[PDB]
Amino acid sequence: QSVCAGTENKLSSLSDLEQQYRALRKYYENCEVVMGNLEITSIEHNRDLSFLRSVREVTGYVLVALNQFRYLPLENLRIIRGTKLYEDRYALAIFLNYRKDGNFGLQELGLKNLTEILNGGVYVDQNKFLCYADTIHWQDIVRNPWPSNLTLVSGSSGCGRCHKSCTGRCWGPTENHCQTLTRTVCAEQCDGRCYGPYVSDCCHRECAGGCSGPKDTDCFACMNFNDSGACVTQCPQTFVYNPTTFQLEHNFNAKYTYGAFCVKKCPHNFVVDSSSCVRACPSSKMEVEENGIKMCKPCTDICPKACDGIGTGSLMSAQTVDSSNIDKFINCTKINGNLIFLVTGIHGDPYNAIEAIDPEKLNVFRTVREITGFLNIQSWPPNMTDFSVFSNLVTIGGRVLYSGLSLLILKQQGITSLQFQSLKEISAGNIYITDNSNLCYYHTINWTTLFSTINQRIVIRDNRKAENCTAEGMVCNHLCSSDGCWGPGPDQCLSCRRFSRGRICIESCNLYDGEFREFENGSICVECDPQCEKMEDGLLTCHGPGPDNCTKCSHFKDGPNCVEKCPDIFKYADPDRECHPCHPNCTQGCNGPTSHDCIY
Amino acid sequence: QSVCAGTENKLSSLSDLEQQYRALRKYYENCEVVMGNLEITSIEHNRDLSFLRSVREVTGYVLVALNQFRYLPLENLRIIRGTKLYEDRYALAIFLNYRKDGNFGLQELGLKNLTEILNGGVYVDQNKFLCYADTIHWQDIVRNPWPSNLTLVSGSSGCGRCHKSCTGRCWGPTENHCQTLTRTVCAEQCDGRCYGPYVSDCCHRECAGGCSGPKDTDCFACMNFNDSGACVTQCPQTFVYNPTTFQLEHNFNAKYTYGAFCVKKCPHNFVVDSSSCVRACPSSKMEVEENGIKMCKPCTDICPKACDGIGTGSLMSAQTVDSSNIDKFINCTKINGNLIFLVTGIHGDPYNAIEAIDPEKLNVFRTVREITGFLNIQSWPPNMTDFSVFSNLVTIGGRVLYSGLSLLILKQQGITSLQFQSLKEISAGNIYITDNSNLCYYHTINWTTLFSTINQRIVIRDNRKAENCTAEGMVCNHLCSSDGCWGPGPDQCLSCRRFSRGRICIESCNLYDGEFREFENGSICVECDPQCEKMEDGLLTCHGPGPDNCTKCSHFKDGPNCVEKCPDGLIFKYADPDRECHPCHPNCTQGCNGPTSHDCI
Amino acid sequence: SHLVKCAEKEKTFCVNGGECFMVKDLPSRYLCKCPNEFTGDRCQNYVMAS
Amino acid sequence: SHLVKCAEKEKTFCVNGGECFMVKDLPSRYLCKCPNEFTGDRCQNYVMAS
Ligand SMILES: *[C@@H]1O[C@H](CO)[C@@H](O[C@@H]2O[C@H](CO)[C@@H](O[C@@H]3O[C@H](CO[C@H]4O[C@H](CO)[C@@H](O)[C@H](O)[C@@H]4O)[C@@H](O)[C@H](O[C@H]4O[C@H](CO)[C@@H](O)[C@H](O)[C@@H]4O)[C@@H]3O)[C@H](O)[C@H]2NC(C)=O)[C@H](O)[C@H]1NC(C)=O
Ligand SMILES: *[C@@H]1O[C@H](CO)[C@@H](O[C@@H]2O[C@H](CO)[C@@H](O[C@@H]3O[C@H](CO[C@H]4O[C@H](CO)[C@@H](O)[C@H](O)[C@@H]4O)[C@@H](O)[C@H](O[C@H]4O[C@H](CO)[C@@H](O)[C@H](O)[C@@H]4O)[C@@H]3O)[C@H](O)[C@H]2NC(C)=O)[C@H](O)[C@H]1NC(C)=O
Ligand SMILES: *[C@@H]1O[C@H](CO)[C@@H](O[C@@H]2O[C@H](CO)[C@@H](O[C@@H]3O[C@H](CO[C@H]4O[C@H](CO)[C@@H](O)[C@H](O)[C@@H]4O)[C@@H](O)[C@H](O[C@H]4O[C@H](CO)[C@@H](O)[C@H](O)[C@@H]4O)[C@@H]3O)[C@H](O)[C@H]2NC(C)=O)[C@H](O)[C@H]1NC(C)=O
Ligand SMILES: *[C@@H]1O[C@H](CO)[C@@H](O[C@@H]2O[C@H](CO)[C@@H](O[C@@H]3O[C@H](CO[C@H]4O[C@H](CO)[C@@H](O)[C@H](O)[C@@H]4O)[C@@H](O)[C@H](O[C@H]4O[C@H](CO)[C@@H](O)[C@H](O)[C@@H]4O)[C@@H]3O)[C@H](O)[C@H]2NC(C)=O)[C@H](O)[C@H]1NC(C)=O
Ligand SMILES: *[C@@H]1O[C@H](CO)[C@@H](O[C@@H]2O[C@H](CO)[C@@H](O[C@@H]3O[C@H](CO[C@H]4O[C@H](CO)[C@@H](O)[C@H](O)[C@@H]4O)[C@@H](O)[C@H](O[C@H]4O[C@H](CO)[C@@H](O)[C@H](O)[C@@H]4O)[C@@H]3O)[C@H](O)[C@H]2NC(C)=O)[C@H](O)[C@H]1NC(C)=O
Ligand SMILES: *[C@@H]1O[C@H](CO)[C@@H](O[C@@H]2O[C@H](CO)[C@@H](O[C@@H]3O[C@H](CO[C@H]4O[C@H](CO)[C@@H](O)[C@H](O)[C@@H]4O)[C@@H](O)[C@H](O[C@H]4O[C@H](CO)[C@@H](O)[C@H](O)[C@@H]4O)[C@@H]3O)[C@H](O)[C@H]2NC(C)=O)[C@H](O)[C@H]1NC(C)=O
Ligand SMILES: *[C@@H]1O[C@H](CO)[C@@H](O[C@@H]2O[C@H](CO)[C@@H](O[C@@H]3O[C@H](CO[C@H]4O[C@H](CO)[C@@H](O)[C@H](O)[C@@H]4O)[C@@H](O)[C@H](O)[C@@H]3O)[C@H](O)[C@H]2NC(C)=O)[C@H](O)[C@H]1NC(C)=O
Ligand SMILES: *[C@@H]1O[C@H](CO)[C@@H](O[C@@H]2O[C@H](CO)[C@@H](O[C@@H]3O[C@H](CO)[C@@H](O)[C@H](O)[C@@H]3O)[C@H](O)[C@H]2NC(C)=O)[C@H](O)[C@H]1NC(C)=O
Ligand SMILES: *[C@@H]1O[C@H](CO)[C@@H](O[C@@H]2O[C@H](CO)[C@@H](O[C@@H]3O[C@H](CO)[C@@H](O)[C@H](O)[C@@H]3O)[C@H](O)[C@H]2NC(C)=O)[C@H](O)[C@H]1NC(C)=O
Ligand SMILES: *[C@@H]1O[C@H](CO)[C@@H](O[C@@H]2O[C@H](CO)[C@@H](O[C@@H]3O[C@H](CO)[C@@H](O)[C@H](O)[C@@H]3O)[C@H](O)[C@H]2NC(C)=O)[C@H](O)[C@H]1NC(C)=O
Ligand SMILES: *[C@@H]1O[C@H](CO)[C@@H](O[C@@H]2O[C@H](CO)[C@@H](O[C@@H]3O[C@H](CO)[C@@H](O)[C@H](O)[C@@H]3O)[C@H](O)[C@H]2NC(C)=O)[C@H](O)[C@H]1NC(C)=O
Ligand SMILES: *[C@@H]1O[C@H](CO)[C@@H](O[C@@H]2O[C@H](CO)[C@@H](O)[C@H](O)[C@H]2NC(C)=O)[C@H](O)[C@H]1NC(C)=O
Ligand SMILES: *[C@@H]1O[C@H](CO)[C@@H](O)[C@H](O)[C@H]1NC(C)=O
Ligand SMILES: *[C@@H]1O[C@H](CO)[C@@H](O)[C@H](O)[C@H]1NC(C)=O
C-alpha cells in the first residue's frame, strides 16, 4: 500500500490560497493509508480535489472545516481509527463549508464506503447547503454510538429526497450511492459485522467495516494486527507454554510485533523485547547487541540515565527545548527522544509566559553522547557561531524521523562553523542543511562516511560559497586527511595523515625529546612507563606501554620490570643498578650474597 | 471439578483378582478428569463398573485389555487428549476381552459421547464378542483421519444390525445408541467441528468434540487453555504492544498461564516467567525472590549448579537413582526435579545389566540444598541406619507431588533415626512415614513447623512404638526445645533454648571465662575480634564483633579501633607508652618519635 | 467569511508574522494565516522543500 | 488362558517376586502378576493406603 503522513495545521493555513491547495496535493496525492490526520482547510470552489479518491484508511481524525467545494471525493474511505481526535472529541468533523454571500458550498458527501469509526464522535453542522447528511445511519458506522459519545448531525436549507429503493438513508439522490448497514441488521447469533442479515452471511469477530466471506483472511479492514493477511488480536511469540509439562518451549512459528504488523525481522536500530520491536528499552534494563540484533536485559548496580527527549516520556506535551525544561539535561549522556530547538524555545513564548533560554544554559548538553531520535535546529542564540555545545555527540539513532530526516539545520545566520569532535555515525534517516549563508566548513566533509546504508543522503544548498570561504582563509588544519573536517583547529578533522594525542592531530610525538616519552602506534602515540630512561640523540626507549618493554630505565632493574626500591629475601643493587638476592635469612638490607653482607 | 491421578502400569496387575477390583475403585471412583492414564485390566464377569460413568476427560491413553465383563460403562467420556500413547501409537486400545474356554467377554462399548481423540490412533482388536464397535466411523473422532495412521479396527459374526433410524454407524442395538458425527458433516467454509450440516451451525476454532453454539463459552471440551469459561489459544499477558507508540504498555486484565487454566496469581512455590507459572527456570538464569514473588533473571559470570532430577531433562527416562546415573549428581546444589530411591536402584537390576549401588556413591548428595520436587525413599542400603547423607538439605519445594505427597518413607527396617539437620521448610504437599519398625525419633518432632500452608498434614501409622523407644532411652538432648529433634545429638534439634554455637546447642557462651571470648544475642553466639585482650575476674570482654566493642586490645589504640603497628606504611604516626597511636609531622615516613619534624630521621 | 480578527489580549497566539483569527461559531475556535516560509497550528515551524 | 510363562532369559524382567507372563499374541507383550504389597509395570513400587 502507498503510505503518506498527515499534517497538524487544523484550521490554520498559508495566506496564499493557491499555496494552501498545492500543499494539500503534496501531502495527500497518490497515497491510500494516511498514518495521521486528514484535514482539508480553506479550499476554493473552483479547485480540483479528485486526487483524494486514492484514500482508503485514516489513522487520526478527518477535518473538513472552511471549504467552498460542492462534492467531497472520499467515496472509497472505509475506516477511520481515531488515534487522535479533533478537540479530543471527534473522529469526523464537517462544518462551516459554505459561502455566506452566495450559493457556493458543500452539497454532497462522497463517503459511500465509510463503514467503521473505531473511536471518537461524528459532527456535521452549519454546512448550509448540505443535502442528505441527517439521513445517514451513523449508529451503524460509529462503534459505541450513544449520545454521551457525541454522534450528531444538524445543513439548514431544504433539498429533494433520494430514490425509494434506499428507504430514506442516502449519500446522494441515486440508488447507486446510499447507506449500507453491517452492524445493526445482523442476526443475534453473530457478533461484530456481516455482509447480509442472515447468520450464514456474518463475518469473523476480529474484522472491521465488512467482509467478502467468513474468514479472517477475507475481510475489508481490521482493528487488530495483520499476520500475513490474517487479522488477529495477538500473533505467535518466541515461546509457547506446554500445559502438560509446565515449562516454556521455543516456537518455530514465532514472529516479532512491529507497529500494526507481525514480521520475521525488525529495523537495525529498534530494540527487540518480549517478541516485539520498540523505539526504546524501559529504564530497568540495559540495551545490548548480540548476533547483530539489539535487545535489552536487567541492568547492574550502575545503569544508563533515564533522560527523555522532546515529544516522548515525561516531555510528551513539549514541542521544543525551552527555559522550563532545559535543566532536565544537566547530567545526561543519552537522550531518549528528539532534540528540537524552535524560535518559541530559544527566544521564549510570551503567550504561555515562558522566558528565553540564557545561552549559558545550553551547556547542559555537553555531556550527551547519543540521541535516539532526530536533531532539529531551527533557532540558536545570535551570539553563538557554532555547535560546540554538542562536541561530545557520538551518534544519532534515527529511530524516529522528521519527514524522513534525522539531522535538520535550517536558516541560521550567526553560524560560521560546526565544531563537532566525537560524531562518527548517523544510524538512520537523511541530512538536511540549508540557507546557512555564513556557514563555510560544510563543503570539507565526506558526509557518506557517517551513514549505515547507501539509502541515506544529504541535501545542501544556499550556504556560504566555498570559493569565498577559501579566499577568506576559513580552511582546516594542514594535517587533515581526505575524510574531511568541520573547523580551523587541529582537533576539528575526522582523521589525519600523522600522529595524534588526545583529541588533537600533531606533527611529531615525544619520542627522542620531552619531559615525558611516548612510543609509536598506527594513528596515535602513547606514553610508556614513567621509570623509563629519557635518552638523547634519537636513542628511543619506549616501544610499548609495559614496564617490561623499556630498553633502559633510571630506577633499579629486575627481570620483568624496574622499581624505585627492591623487595625487603632482600634484593640488593649492583654497580649496573640491577637487584640480586641476599642471604636467605636477611630481609632488612644488604650488599652481597652471604650472611656477613646483611645491613641494618 | 473432581480430579484423580490415574495409573501407569500398562498390562500388569495384582495376582489377587479381588484386590485388582478394589484398586480400580480406589483410583477412579467419584472423579471426572483423569490425569495420567485410564486402564482397566483382568476384571471378572458380573462385577459392578457403574462408578466409571463419572469420567468425562482422560489426559493420556485409555486401555481395556484381558477383561471378562459384558459392558464398558464410560457413557459420559467426551475427549481423550493422548499426551502419552499405548506402545507410543494408540490413544484408545481395546483387546483380548474374552475367555476362549467359555462364553464370557466384552460385547458393547458405552462410548456414545466420545467425539474427540487429539493424538495417536485407535486399536480395537481380537475381542471375540463385540457387536457394534466395527461399524463406527472412527475418522470423525481422531485428529489424524487416515486408515494407515496408527489405527486398526477389526469381532465375531451373528450379532444383530444397527437400528433402522441409523445408516449403520452405531454403538448399540436400538435407538439412542447411534454415533453423532461432528467433523465429517460440516460445511466446506467451517474450521474445526460443528453441531449441524449448515455453515450457520459451525463452532468456534478452539472447541473440542462438540458444541451448542458459535461462542467460545458454549461448548463441551476445550483445546489449549480455559480462560474462566472461554476457550482460547493463550491468555492476556502482563504487557500489550501499542501499534502507534511502538512500545510495550502495561495490561489491566493480565493472567498467568498455569497448566491448562489461567489464574490471577501463581502458587507460592512456583517461579514466574513471561506471564506464566513454570516448575523450573532455564539454566542460563537464576531464580530470585522480590517482594515475596519468585521470578527468574540472567545469572552472573559464576552462578549456582542447577541439576536434573529423576523424570526430567537428561534423566527423563530414569525411574530411580541407581549405579548408572549417580555420577551425574557430584557437584549439584539445586535439583530441578524429583529424587527417588526404588529397590531396583539400590539392590541392582540384572535384566538391564545394572549393578547394585556402592553405599559410598550416595555421598554425592551431601552438597544439595534444595530439591524442587518430592523426596521418595522406598529402599536404602541395609547397613545405613539414618539419612545423614542429606544433612545439608534445607528445602523440599513440592512443585511436583507423588499423589499429593512431598516426603515419603516406606518399610525400611535398617533405620533407627532420621538425622536430617539443615531441613527448615517443606513448601507444599503431605508427609507419609510408615512401617519403619526400628525408627524412634519420628514421634518427638513438631511437624507443623515445617509447613507453608494450613492444608499440609503428616501420616504416621506403624513405626516403632513411642513408649518402647522411651523405655530404651531413645530421646533427645536435655537442652532441645519442645519443637523436637531428628536424632540424639546436641546439633540435631529443630530448635533449642538458651544459645547455639553454629549448629551445636549450648547452655552458655563463657562471656567472662574459658579459652575463648565471644558475644551473644538472640540465642546465637559469635567469636570476638582475636586482637582483643581476654578479661578475667567476672568481667565481660566483648559487646560485639568489632575491636571498638571490647574492653582492651593487645594491639595499639587508633581512635576507637585497634591496629597492629601504626608506624607501618602510611600521613604518618607514632604510638605512646599507653599503646595509643598519634600523628607525626608530614615527610616522616622513614621514622619518627612524636608529633613533630624535630624527632624524625 | 466565517472568521473575525483576534482581540489584542490574544496577541502572540500566532508567531513569526502570522495573523490570528477567530471562528464566528460558539466555545470559539482560533487559527492563523501566515507567510509561505512558516507552518504549524501557530506558524511556529519552517516550511521545508527541495 | 491368553498368557504363557516367561522363558528363563526373560524371568528377571519382573522385580519384587512377581510372576512373569508373555501374551500369546504376535510383537509379543510382557506383563507380571504382583504380590499384594507391590504395583507398577515390573512390580517395582509399593502399594499404599491412607
Ligand atoms: C468500496 O470498497 C469496495 C470493497 O472493498 C471496493 O471494491 C474493490 O475493488 C477492487 C478493484 O476493482 C477489487 O480488487 C480486484 O479484485 C479482483 C478479484 O475479483 C474480485 O471480484 C469477484 C467478483 O467479481 C470476487 O469473487 C472476488 O472475491 C474479488 O472480490 C482481482 O482480479 C483484481 O486484480 C487486478 O486489478 C489490480 C488493480 O490494482 C491489479 O493490481 C492486478 O494485477 C489485477 O490486474 C483486484 O485485486 C476488490 O476485490 C473490490 N472488493 C470487493 C469486495 O468487491 C471499491 O473499490 C470501493 N469503492 C470505490 C468507490 O472505489
Ligand atoms: C495485510 O497485509 C498485506 C500485506 O502487506 C496487505 O496486502 C496488500 O494488498 C493491497 C491491496 O489491498 C496491495 O496494494 C495494491 O497493490 C497493487 C500491486 O499488486 C501487485 O504486486 C504485489 C507485489 O508487490 C503482488 O503481491 C500482487 O499480487 C500484485 O501482483 C498496486 O497496483 C496498487 O496500487 C495502484 O492502485 C491504487 C488504487 O488506489 C493507486 O492509488 C496507485 O497509485 C496504484 O496505481 C496497490 O498498491 C498491496 O501491495 C498488498 N501488499 C502485499 C505486500 O502484498 C493487506 O491489504 C493487509 N490487510 C488485510 C486486511 O489483509
Ligand atoms: C614492546 O611492546 C610491543 C607492543 O607495542 C610488543 O609487541 C608484541 O608482539 C608480539 C608478537 O611479536 C605479540 O604477541 C602475539 O599476540 C597475538 C595476540 O594475542 C592476544 O589475542 C589472543 C586472541 O585469541 C589471545 O588468545 C591472547 O591471550 C592475547 O590476548 C597472538 O596471537 C600471538 O600468538 C602466536 O605467536 C606466539 C609467539 O610466541 C606463539 O607462541 C603462539 O602459538 C601463536 O602462534 C602472539 O602471542 C604481543 O601481543 C605484542 N605485545 C603487545 C603489547 O602488543 C613487544 O614485544 C614489546 N617489546 C618488549 C621488549 O617487550
Ligand atoms: C453427553 O455429553 C453431553 C454434553 O456435555 C451431556 O449433555 C448435557 O447434560 C448436562 C448434565 O449432565 C446438562 O446440564 C444441565 O442442564 C440443565 C438444563 O439447561 C438448559 O439451559 C441451557 C442454557 O445454556 C441449555 O443449553 C440447555 O439445552 C437447557 O435448555 C441446567 O438446568 C443444569 O444446571 C442447573 O443444575 C445444576 C445441578 O448441579 C446446578 O449446578 C446449576 O447451577 C443449575 O442450577 C445443567 O446445566 C446439559 O445441559 C446437557 N447438554 C445438552 C447439549 O443436552 C450429556 O449428559 C452427556 N452424556 C450422555 C450419556 O448423554
Ligand atoms: C472451563 O473452566 C470452568 C471453570 O473456570 C469449568 O467450569 C466447571 O463446570 C462444571 C460443570 O460443567 C462444574 O462441575 C459441577 O459443579 C456442580 C456445582 O458445584 C460447585 O458449586 C457448589 C455451590 O454450593 C459448591 O459446593 C461446589 O464445591 C462446586 O464449587 C456440582 O454439583 C457437579 O457435581 C455433581 O454431579 C456429578 C455427576 O455429574 C457428581 O459426581 C457429583 O457428586 C455432584 O452430584 C459438578 O461438580 C465445575 O464446578 C465448574 N468449575 C468451576 C471452577 O466453576 C468449565 O467446565 C471449563 N470448560 C471446559 C470446556 O473445560
Ligand atoms: C560496636 O558495638 C555496637 C553495639 O554495641 C555496634 O553498633 C550497632 O551496629 C548495628 C549494625 O551492625 C547498627 O544497626 C544499624 O543501625 C542503623 C541506624 O538506625 C538505628 O540508630 C538510629 C539512631 O538515631 C535510630 O533512630 C534507629 O531507630 C536505629 O536504632 C540502621 O540504618 C540500620 O538498618 C536500617 O538501614 C539499612 C540501610 O542499608 C537497611 O538495610 C535496614 O533494612 C534498616 O532499614 C541498622 O539497624 C546499630 O544501630 C548499632 N548500635 C548502636 C548502639 O550504635 C557497632 O557497630 C560495633 N562496632 C563494630 C566496628 O562492629
Ligand atoms: C551531577 O552529578 C554530580 C556527580 O557527578 C552530582 O554531585 C556533585 O558532584 C560534585 C563533583 O564530585 C561534588 O563536588 C565536590 O564536593 C566535595 C565535597 O563533598 C563532601 O562534602 C559535602 C558537603 O556538603 C557533602 O554533601 C558530600 O556528601 C561530601 O561528603 C569536594 O571535596 C570536591 O572538591 C567537589 O567540590 C558535589 O558536592 C556533588 N553534589 C552533590 C549534591 O552531591 C551533582 O549533584 C549532579 N547534578 C545534578 C543537577 O543532578
Ligand atoms: C569518501 O568516502 C568514500 C566512502 O568510504 C571513499 O570512497 C572509496 O574510494 C576508494 C578509493 O577510490 C575505494 O577503494 C579502491 O580505490 C581504487 C582506486 O583508487 C580502486 O582501484 C579499487 O577498486 C577500490 O575502489 C573505495 O572502494 C571507496 N569506497 C566506497 C564505499 O565507495 C572516498 O575515497 C572518501 N573520500 C573522498 C575524498 O571521496
Ligand atoms: C594502538 O592503536 C590500536 C588501533 O590502531 C589500538 O587497538 C584497539 O584497542 C581498543 C582498546 O579499547 C579496542 O577496542 C575494543 O572496543 C570494543 C567495543 O565494543 C570492546 O568490546 C573491546 O573490549 C575493545 O576495548 C580496538 O578493537 C583495538 N583496535 C584494533 C584495530 O585492534 C591500541 O589499543 C593502540 N594502543 C595504545 C597503546 O593506545
Ligand atoms: C508446634 O509449633 C507451633 C508453632 O510454633 C506451636 O503453635 C503455637 O501455639 C501457641 C500456644 O497455643 C499459640 O499461641 C497462642 O496464640 C493465640 C493467637 O490468638 C493467643 O490468643 C494465645 O494467647 C497464645 O499466644 C501460637 O499462636 C501457635 N502458633 C502457631 C503458628 O500456630 C505449637 O505449640 C508447637 N507444638 C509443640 C509440640 O510445642
Ligand atoms: C545478634 O543479632 C544479629 C542481628 O542484629 C544477628 O545477625 C543477623 O542474623 C540474621 C539471621 O538470623 C540475618 O538475617 C538474614 O540475612 C540473610 C542475608 O542473605 C537473608 O537471606 C535472610 O532472609 C535474613 O534476612 C541478619 O542479616 C544478621 N544481621 C547482621 C547484622 O549480620 C546475630 O546472629 C545475633 N547474634 C550474634 C552473636 O551475632
Ligand atoms: C553578543 O551580545 C551582545 C549583547 O550582550 C551584543 O553586543 C551589543 O550589540 C549592540 C548592537 O546594536 C551594540 O549597540 C552594543 O554596544 C553591544 N554591547 C556590547 C557590550 O558590546 C553583540 O552584538 C552580540 N553578538 C552577536 C554576534 O549576536
Ligand atoms: C566573494 O568573493 C569575491 C572576491 O573573490 C567578492 O567580489 C564577493 O563580493 C564575495 N561575495 C560575498 C557575498 O561577500
Ligand atoms: C518393645 O521392645 C522389646 C525389646 O525387647 C521387644 O521385644 C518388643 O517386641 C517391643 N514391643 C513393641 C510393641 O514395640
Question: In angstroms, rounded to a whole number, what is the distance separating the alpha carbons of residues B559 and A508?
Answer: 55
Question: In angstroms, rounded to a whole number, what is the distance separating the alpha carbons of residues B155 and B107?
Answer: 9
Residues in chain A: 600
As for how many domains chain A has, the answer is 4
Question: In angstroms, rounded to a whole number, what is the distance separating the alpha carbons of residues B19 and D37?
Answer: 11
Instruction: Give the distance from residue A409's alpha carbon to the nearest chain C alpha carbon, in angstroms.
Output: 11
Residues 6+ apart with CB under 8 A from B178: B112, B162, B163, B165, B166, B169, B170, B171
B542 located within any domain: no
- DSSP 8-state assignment for residue B389: G
B279 located within any domain: yes
Q: In this structure, are strands B247-250 and B225-227 parallel, antiparallel, or unpaired?
A: unpaired
Q: What are phi and psi of B526, to 5 degrees?
A: -135, 135
A386-414: b or e for each residue (b if 16 or more CB lie within 10 Å)? bbbbbbbbbbbbbbbebeebbbbbbebee
> Quick check: B8 and D41 CB within 8 A?
yes
Residues in chain B: 601
Residues 6+ apart with CB under 8 A from A535: A512, A541, A552
Task: Tell me the β-bridge partners of D31.
Answer: D21
Question: In angstroms, rounded to a whole number, what is the distance separating the alpha carbons of residues A50 and A25?
Answer: 10
Co-location of B268 and B320 in the same domain: no
Question: In angstroms, rounded to a whole number, what is the distance separating the alpha carbons of residues B150 and B144?
Answer: 9
Spatial contact of C10 and C20, defined as CB atoms under 8 Å apart:
yes
Task: Tell me the β-bridge partners of B505.
Answer: B500
Nearest Cα to B194, choosing from B178, B207, B177, B175?
B207
Question: In angstroms, rounded to a whole number, what is the distance separating the alpha carbons of residues A107 and A6?
Answer: 25
Place of cell 512443585: B399
Which of A166, A181, A207 is the last residue before a domain boundary? A166
Q: Which of A10, A14, A84, A97 to mutate to test the interface with C (most CBs of C within 10 A)?
A: A14
Spatial contact of A442 and A463, defined as CB atoms under 8 Å apart:
yes
A505 located within any domain: no
Q: What is the 3-state secondary structure (H, E, C) of B401-438?
A: CECCEEEEEECCCCCCCCCCCCCCEECCCEEEEECCCC
Which of B128, B153, B178 is the last residue before a domain boundary? B153
- DSSP 8-state assignment for residue B44: P
Cα-based distances in Å from B581 to A193, B563, B588, B595: 90, 9, 15, 11
What are the E-state strand segments in chain D?
3-5, 19-23, 30-34, 38-39, 45-46
Spatial contact of A247 and B279, defined as CB atoms under 8 Å apart:
yes
Question: In angstroms, rounded to a whole number, what is the distance separating the alpha carbons of residues B524 and B245?
Answer: 57
Nearest Cα to A93, choosing from A105, A109, A104?
A109
* Ligand 2 atom 47 nearest Cα: A1
**Technique of determination:** cryo-EM
Q: How far is ligand 13, taken at its centre, from the CA of residue A444, in Å?
A: 19
Nearest Cα to A309, choosing from A300, A318, A299?
A318
A448 lines ligand 8 (CB under 6 A): yes
Spatial contact of B322 and B345, defined as CB atoms under 8 Å apart:
yes
Q: End-to-end distance of chain D based on CA atoms, in angstroms?
A: 35
Nearest Cα to B342, choosing from B369, B314, B375?
B375
Q: Which of D12, D14, D15 to mutate to test the interface with B (most CBs of B within 10 A)?
A: D15
A337 located within any domain: yes
Measured between CA atoms, the residue of chain B closest to residue A226 is B243
Co-location of B429 and B383 in the same domain: yes
Cα-based distances in Å from A337 to A281, B185, B490: 12, 58, 65
> Quick check: D19 and B15 CB within 8 A?
yes
- DSSP 8-state assignment for residue A585: T
Task: Tell me the β-bridge partners of A262.
Answer: A257
> Quick check: B12 and D42 CB within 8 A?
yes
Domain coordinates in residue numbering, chain D:
3-46
Question: In angstroms, rounded to a whole number, what is the distance separating the alpha carbons of residues A367 and A328?
Answer: 12
Place of cell 550556504: A463
Instruction: Give the distance from residue C19's alpha carbon to the nearest chain A alpha carbon, in angstroms.
Output: 9
Please classify residue C9 by burial: count the beta carbons closer than 10 Å to its beta carbon, then call 0-12 exposed, 13-18 middle and 19+ buried: exposed
To test the pocket of ligand 8, the residue of A425, A445, A448, A458 to mutate (highest count of ligand atoms within 8 Å of its CB) is: A448
B519 located within any domain: no
Spatial contact of B90 and B61, defined as CB atoms under 8 Å apart:
yes
Task: Tell me the β-bridge partners of A219.
Answer: A211
**Which positions in chain B touch D39 (Cβ < 8 Å)?**
9, 12, 14, 23
Question: In angstroms, rounded to a whole number, what is the distance separating the alpha carbons of residues A344 and A352?
Answer: 10
Position A134: which residue type? Answer: D
Say yes or no: D4 contacts chain B, CB-CB below 8 A: no
Residue B260, domain extent: 239-298
Place of cell 554538542: A390
Position B39: which residue type? Answer: E
Question: In angstroms, rounded to a whole number, what is the distance separating the alpha carbons of residues B52 and B40?
Answer: 10
Position A243: which residue type? Answer: P
Fold of D3-46: Laminin (2.10.25)
Co-location of A290 and A312 in the same domain: no
Spatial contact of B408 and B379, defined as CB atoms under 8 Å apart:
no
Question: In angstroms, rounded to a whole number, what is the distance separating the alpha carbons of residues B346 and B156?
Answer: 49
Place of cell 516479532: A256
- DSSP 8-state assignment for residue B111: -
Q: For residue A282, count other CB atoms closer than 10 A to its CB.
A: 13
Query: For chain C, how are helix, strand and coil distributed in percent, rounded to 5?
Result: 5, 35, 60
Q: What are phi and psi of A360, to 5 degrees?
A: -70, -30
Co-location of B135 and B7 in the same domain: yes
Q: What is the 3-state secondary structure (H, E, C) of A8-21?
A: CCCCCEECCHHHHH
* Ligand 2 atom 33 nearest Cα: A1
Spatial contact of B445 and B485, defined as CB atoms under 8 Å apart:
yes
Say yes or no: B151 contacts chain A, CB-CB below 8 A: no
B585 located within any domain: yes
A257 located within any domain: yes
A196-226: b or e for each residue (b if 16 or more CB lie within 10 Å)? eeebbbbbbbbbbbbbeebbbeebbbbbbbe
Spatial contact of A25 and A48, defined as CB atoms under 8 Å apart:
no
Co-location of B446 and B339 in the same domain: yes
Tally of helices (H runs) and strands (E runs) in chain A: 4, 41
Co-location of B267 and B370 in the same domain: no
A298-315: b or e for each residue (b if 16 or more CB lie within 10 Å)? eeeeeebeebbbbbbeeb
Nearest Cα to A142, choosing from A129, A161, A163, A124?
A124
Residues in chain D: 50
- Give residue numbers after which chain B breaks (C–N above 2.5 Å): 154, 570
Residues A318, A411, A434: CA angle, nearest 5 degrees: 110
Task: Tell me the β-bridge partners of A72.
Answer: A109
Range C13-17 contact pairs with CB under 8 angstroms and sequence separation of 24 or more: C13/A351, C13/C42, C14/A12, C14/C42, C14/C43, C15/A343, C15/A344, C15/A349, C15/A351, C15/C42, C15/C43, C15/C44, C16/A343, C16/C43, C16/C44, C17/C43
Residue A250: give its domain's CATH number.
2.10.220.10
Question: In angstroms, rounded to a whole number, what is the distance separating the alpha carbons of residues A97 and A71?
Answer: 11
Largest CA distance in chain D: 41
Say yes or no: B180 contacts chain D, CB-CB below 8 A: no
Position B98: which residue type? Answer: Y
Say yes or no: A461 contacts chain C, CB-CB below 8 A: yes
Q: Which chains touch D (3 or more CB pairs under 8 A)?
A: B
Nearest Cα to A495, choosing from A390, A544, A424?
A424
Torsion angle in degrees (nearest 10) through CA of A19, A24, A27, A31: -150
Question: In angstroms, rounded to a whole number, what is the distance separating the alpha carbons of residues A318 and A324?
Answer: 10
Tally of helices (H runs) and strands (E runs) in chain B: 3, 43
CB nearest to B15's CB, from D2, D13, D34: D34
Nearest Cα to B572, choosing from B560, B588, B559?
B588
Co-location of A293 and A312 in the same domain: no
Do at least 3 CB pairs under 8 Å connect A with D? no
Q: What is the 3-state secondary structure (H, E, C) of B327-366?
A: HHHCCCCEEECEEEECHHHHCCEHHHCECCCCHHHHHHHH
Q: What are phi and psi of B317, to 5 degrees?
A: -80, -10
Co-location of A245 and A322 in the same domain: no
Place of cell 638476592: A581
Ranges of H-type helices in A192-267: none
Ligand closest to CA A29: 2
User: What is the grid cell recorded at B1?
Assistant: 471439578
Spatial contact of A231 and A193, defined as CB atoms under 8 Å apart:
no
Please classify residue A369 by burial: count the beta carbons closer than 10 Å to its beta carbon, then call 0-12 exposed, 13-18 middle and 19+ buried: middle
A95 located within any domain: yes
A330 lines ligand 7 (CB under 6 A): yes
Question: In angstroms, rounded to a whole number, what is the distance separating the alpha carbons of residues B115 and B143?
Answer: 10
User: What is the grid cell recorded at B109?
Assistant: 462399548
Task: Tell me the β-bridge partners of B262.
Answer: B257
Question: In angstroms, rounded to a whole number, what is the distance separating the alpha carbons of residues B4 and B22?
Answer: 16
A222 lines ligand 2 (CB under 6 A): yes
Co-location of B286 and B323 in the same domain: no
Resolution for the entry shown, Å: 3.4
Give the distance, in angstroms, between the CA of residue B120 and the centroid of all CA atoms in the same chain. 28
Which of A166, A188, A219 is the last residue before a domain boundary? A166
Residue A81: give its domain's CATH number.
3.80.20.20
Spatial contact of A385 and A418, defined as CB atoms under 8 Å apart:
no
